[PDB]
Amino acid sequence: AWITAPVALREGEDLSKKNPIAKIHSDLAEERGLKITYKYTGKGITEPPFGIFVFNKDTGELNVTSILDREETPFFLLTGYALDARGNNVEKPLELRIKVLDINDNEPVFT
């Protein structure tokens, strides 16, 4: 497979129109008439911190609920999965990272 650098998003903006921030889809399923159900995992989905992400089981899509902050977190690490109606992990996993990008939204403080 291909070792990736993450998707970048920026702090302090609305991400409504930047979704979906991951998506699993397969037209080899389509050609066969097959359906699939999904899962995601990690930060915000099965591990903390929370209040940041959600995912769709039917459509494979992963969303962002909120505005990021870079002084909260520089990055995030998750895993997406695909599975059938008899329990079988159907394909290789979505290994997946997200990067949080930084602007000058704070002023210096003395020691």
Binding site: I45, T46, P48, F55, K57
Partner: protein, 111 residues
């Protein structure tokens, strides 16, 4: 009612009772047309399934997936209530919120 409320301890066992819900319907009593059943249409975080809903009763149980208070201190669910023999179309119906509050246990060691 619009909101229903429950609680449970952490590090608990499967099929452990949390709370009850109810609904009602306007076809004649003791028919398949008014025979109420229940389902979870919302959970946060949605994966995994940590709760189970007996369609017999409207009792909310735990599943085999263990809750942790060090992960989350509350869970909000929405539930949908249905009848008859047809299936779900795109047109909605009235749904109701559930709220499951977590109890700590002494899984952490004083030093």
């Amino acid at each position: 009612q619009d909101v229903f409320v429950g609680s449970v301890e952490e590090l608990s066992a499967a099929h452990t009772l949390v709370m009850k819900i109810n609904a009602t319907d306007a076809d004649e009593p003791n028919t398949l047309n008014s025979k109420i059943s229940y389902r979870i249409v919302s959970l946060e975080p949605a994966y995994p399934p940590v709760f189970y809903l007996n369609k017999d009763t409207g009792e909310i149980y735990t599943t085999s997936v263990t809750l942790d208070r060090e992960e989350h201190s509350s869970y909000t669910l929405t539930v949908e209530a249905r009848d008859g023999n047809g299936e779900v179309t795109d047109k909605p119906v009235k749904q109701a919120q559930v709220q499951i509050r977590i109890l700590d246990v002494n899984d952490n060691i004083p030093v």
